Amino acid sequence: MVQNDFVDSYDVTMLLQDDDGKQYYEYHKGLSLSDFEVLYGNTADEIIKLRLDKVL
Amino acid sequence: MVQNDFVDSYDVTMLLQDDDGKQYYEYHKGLSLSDFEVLYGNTADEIIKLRLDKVL
């Protein structure tokens, strides 16, 4: 995504696992380190991947 | 045996910015989610990216 539209505040990409073991990816951008701490604390599940990126 | 080639526990890969205005890495294989909280809490600098990845 272009660095003129994806760009406000940090990006958080996370990947977790489900009952079929087939996994679920999502990204969460235009937020901050405190909002990353929400997703990290909300997880309570099979963690597979996690990323954060202070945009631009 | 400790991480020979990623192979132990959680891969953690952070990136923070120096006063020179460029990034430096914090690669840490063989961690856990509690050790990630230590790394994220103790490194304390201008964080630009991070990753966590459960072992292969």
Curated annotation (Swiss-Prot), chains A, B:
Q: What does the subunit section of this Swiss-Prot or TrEMBL entry state?
A: Homodimer. Interacts with host UDG; this interaction inhibits the uracil-DNA glycosylase.
Organism this protein belongs to: Bacillus phage phi29
Listed A to Z, the keywords are: Early protein, Host-virus interaction
Domain of life of the source: Viruses
Q: What is this protein called?
A: Protein p56
The organism that produces this protein has a lineage beginning with: Viruses, Duplodnaviria, Heunggongvirae, Uroviricota, Caudoviricetes
One Pfam annotation reads: UDG-inhib_P56
**One GO term (biological process):** biological process involved in interaction with host
Similarity annotation: Belongs to the phi29likevirus protein p56 family.
Protein's UniProt keywords contain DNA-binding: no
